[PDB]
Design an enzyme around this catalytic site. Structure first.
Site, PDB file in Angstrom:
ATOM      1  N   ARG A  21      83.035  65.042  24.842  1.00 11.68           N
ATOM      2  CA  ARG A  21      83.358  64.723  23.329  1.00 11.68           C
ATOM      3  C   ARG A  21      84.604  65.103  22.980  1.00 11.68           C
ATOM      4  O   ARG A  21      85.043  64.411  21.915  1.00 11.68           O
ATOM      5  CB  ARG A  21      82.405  65.947  22.775  1.00 11.68           C
ATOM      6  CG  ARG A  21      80.765  65.874  22.856  1.00 11.68           C
ATOM      7  CD  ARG A  21      80.211  67.044  22.374  1.00 11.68           C
ATOM      8  NE  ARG A  21      78.615  67.051  22.635  1.00 11.68           N
ATOM      9  CZ  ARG A  21      77.601  67.272  22.108  1.00 11.68           C
ATOM     10  NH1 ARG A  21      77.609  67.113  20.554  1.00 11.68           N
ATOM     11  NH2 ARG A  21      76.417  67.201  22.367  1.00 11.68           N
ATOM     12  N   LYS A  50      57.226  63.472  22.452  1.00 15.37           N
ATOM     13  CA  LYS A  50      56.026  64.012  21.465  1.00 15.37           C
ATOM     14  C   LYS A  50      56.015  62.675  20.671  1.00 15.37           C
ATOM     15  O   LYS A  50      56.641  62.389  19.830  1.00 15.37           O
ATOM     16  CB  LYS A  50      56.429  65.091  20.635  1.00 15.37           C
ATOM     17  CG  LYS A  50      56.697  66.357  21.461  1.00 15.37           C
ATOM     18  CD  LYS A  50      57.295  67.561  20.940  1.00 15.37           C
ATOM     19  CE  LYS A  50      57.920  68.597  21.682  1.00 15.37           C
ATOM     20  NZ  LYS A  50      58.265  69.893  20.953  1.00 15.37           N
ATOM     21  N   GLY A  56      69.402  61.949  22.187  1.00 20.47           N
ATOM     22  CA  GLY A  56      70.207  63.221  22.890  1.00 20.47           C
ATOM     23  C   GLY A  56      69.915  62.934  24.468  1.00 20.47           C
ATOM     24  O   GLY A  56      70.971  62.704  25.281  1.00 20.47           O
ATOM     25  N   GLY A  84      70.116  63.018  17.034  1.00 25.42           N
ATOM     26  CA  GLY A  84      69.385  63.388  15.664  1.00 25.42           C
ATOM     27  C   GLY A  84      69.783  62.313  14.621  1.00 25.42           C
ATOM     28  O   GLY A  84      68.985  61.933  14.214  1.00 25.42           O
TER      29      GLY A  84
END
Ligand code: ADP
Ligand code: MG
Ligand code: MG
Ligand code: MG
Length: 416
Positions: free
Chosen positions: A38, A215, A373, A396
């Protein structure tokens, strides 16, 4: 729109102070950085500013979840300033706060070419607008203090650059509160804007969406929105069992299943039919006797069913063929979510085989976009970050974009 935002390449920085929000939220094992990616990623934006005669570059970021309280020997950015210096080849002046009069004086008119890293933004509750006190109770920022926080950040430069796409879904102070005349996306933000403009505004065709992960409940709006963009959709991962149990009456054993989402599977399939979207579901599985890296493994099809007590943790070889056929047809792909438990080697073959296909697709001209992610961790894990068109830096935030939402940090950028 993602297509009409000011970016750093169009921004005159000569003799200006640049306050730049970056994502320096790196993984740490006790004050040591375990992955400096990053930080490397922001260097192009920083060096561009310096090469084009910026007077200064003031870097602000968060690290972890200090939740609005100073935690300088758990979550200080100090380590990042050391790492940054190595990567830049230039001294980084680290300050132990990010607002207040001492910071502002350091930032008012520094030496031409100066690079400054401020302390963790989330040591102040005014960044997020809420957090937790040392007893774990809610605290809510005061309007007046938010104002002063944002005013103090805005003092630290003449122009604002946001290169922190991973936080652009949060209406936090450093994302939406910096009151300066020009607010530009950095080079990381630009790439995210350009690729997701392809996914959402003007895709090459056929356009395939590969949607997996765990999910079903967290994927409903992603699925619904992508059904208005795409020509084809692969459904894999754990959420595929909700579809299969409902549509085929599959015996799925203890595979992930969402009783609530099941009630709308038919609704999603109906919309796919109304829009002409070809849905590719898995047809075979690697099973596991428990949710463990060293589980006993077996094999199953939709026809065989998954044994009672066992869970489907990966697709099987015939699913990988069906998946590769859809990838073969695509001129553009957005992939969000691995198609099995890729963390564990016995259940990672489907995700790895699919990645191999996406890499071959890219080679022959396919535009390949990885969101997420975990899907991004997959690329990092098999060293495929440079073999696809784009790996998103914001888990996200990329998901909310794909869901059709406006990102407050993107919206706050200057237009034109
Ligand atoms: N069949 C499966 N059963 C249980 N978990 C799965 C299955 N397939 C994938 N997963 C899990 O999905 C997780 C990724 O899900 P998610 O967070 O929704 O993806 P992303 O973060 O890329 O959006 C991984 O931890 C992976 O182990
Ligand atoms: Mg995840
Ligand atoms: Mg993330
Ligand atoms: Mg705007």
């Amino acid at each position: 729109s993602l297509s009409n935002k000011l970016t750093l390449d169009k921004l005159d920085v000569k003799g200006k102070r640049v306050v730049m929000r970056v994502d320096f939220n790196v993984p740490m094992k006790n004050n040591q950085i375990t992955n400096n990616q990053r930080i490397k990623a922001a260097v192009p934006s920083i060096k561009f500013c310096l090469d084009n005669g910026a007077k200064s570059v003031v870097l602000m970021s968060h690290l972890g979840r200090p939740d609005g309280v100073p935690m300088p020997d758990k979550y200080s950015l100090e380590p990042v300033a050391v790492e940054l210096k190595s990567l830049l080849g230039k001294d980084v002046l680290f300050l132990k706060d990010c607002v207040g009069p001492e910071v502002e004086k350091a930032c008012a008119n520094p030496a031409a070419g100066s690079v400054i890293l401020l302390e963790n933004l989330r040591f102040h509750v005014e960044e997020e607008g809420k957090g937790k006190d040392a007893s774990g109770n809610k605290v809510k920022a005061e309007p007046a203090k938010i104002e002063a926080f944002r005013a103090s950040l805005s003092k630290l430069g003449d122009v604002y650059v946001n290169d922190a796409f991973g936080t652009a879904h949060r209406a936090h102070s450093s994302m939406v509160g910096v009151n300066l005349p020009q607010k530009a996306g950095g080079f990381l933000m630009k790439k995210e804007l350009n690729y997701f403009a392809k996914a959402l505004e003007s895709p090459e065709r056929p356009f395939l969406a590969i949607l997996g992960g765990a999910k079903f409940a967290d994927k409903i709006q992603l699925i619904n929105n992508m059904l208005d963009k795409v020509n084809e959709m692969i459904i894999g991962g754990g959420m595929a069992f909700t579809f299969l149990k409902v549509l085929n009456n599959m015996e799925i054993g203890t595979s992930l299943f969402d009783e609530e989402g099941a009630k709308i599977v038919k609704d999603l399939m109906s919309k796919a039919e109304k829009n002409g979207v070809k849905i590719t579901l898995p047809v075979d599985f690697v099973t596991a006797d428990k949710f463990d890296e060293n589980a006993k493994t077996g094999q199953a099809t939709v026809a065989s069913g998954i044994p009672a007590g066992w869970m489907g943790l990966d697709c099987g070889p015939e699913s990988s063929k069906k998946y590769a056929e859809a990838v073969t047809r695509a001129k553009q792909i957005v992939w969000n979510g691995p198609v099995g438990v890729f963390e564990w080697e016995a259940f990672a073959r489907g995700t790895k085989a699919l990645m191999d296909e996406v890499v071959k697709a890219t080679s022959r001209g396919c535009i390949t976009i990885i969101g997420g992610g975990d899907t991004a961790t997959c690329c990092a894990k098999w060293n495929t970050e440079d073999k696809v068109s784009h790996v998103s830096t914001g888990g996200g935030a990329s998901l909310e974009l794909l869901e059709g939402k406006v990102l407050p940090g993107v919206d706050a950028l200057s237009n034109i």
